[PDB]
Design a protein around this nucleic acid. Sequence first.
DNA 1: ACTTTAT
DNA 2: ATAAAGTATAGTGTG
Length: 192
Amino acid sequence: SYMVARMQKMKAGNLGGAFKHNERVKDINPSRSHLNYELTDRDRSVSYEKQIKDYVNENKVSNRAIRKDAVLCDEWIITSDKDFFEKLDEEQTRTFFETAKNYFAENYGESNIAYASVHLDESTPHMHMGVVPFENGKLSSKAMFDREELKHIQEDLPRYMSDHGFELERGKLNSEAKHKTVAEFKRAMADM
DNA sequence: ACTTTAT
DNA sequence: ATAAAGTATAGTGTG
Ligand SMILES: [Cl-]
Ligand SMILES: [Mg+2]
Ligand SMILES: [Mn+2]
Ligand code: NA
């Protein structure tokens, strides 16, 4: 079965709306809303925008103030096909998502992992994990998540997952498939 | 590459 | 004036 991993570039403007989904202030049921779990040691009340800025500001090497259009984090999505989460119990659910969080902690840094919101109230159990691209005193997604790196991630991470009792396969190498938005993909299934 | 941002 | 970092990527499926 296919291992699904995809980041989206997250700036201050769109971090408003991304935080506004990740915690609740219409494809969801409120009956399943609880039980959902956060996988970092972050303060529930504090927003991502405030957490990350201050984490960078205090840790950044250069004195040049943070640019307005900066990539503050990269909300990676970890999920798979529905046949995968069926053969998984409730405590193996936690074990699956924690190895995902770990891969990005082992290769890209521990306190870089700003959040890890797990959603069980949508169609598939999926984690929204936001990785801050802070390395060598620099904040750059351009330098951390480049062309070379995402090819490695698509190769290495599923093979890392297969070292932990889970049975997956990497997505089709050198794919030609273009990302369809949730609204687009829904419509892409309205006709067949 | 080429362009936008903060020195 | 300078220069690090913005744009993309890579992958699947009801994010
Ligand atoms: Cl649902
Ligand atoms: Mg047809
Ligand atoms: Mn969600
Ligand atoms: Na390609």
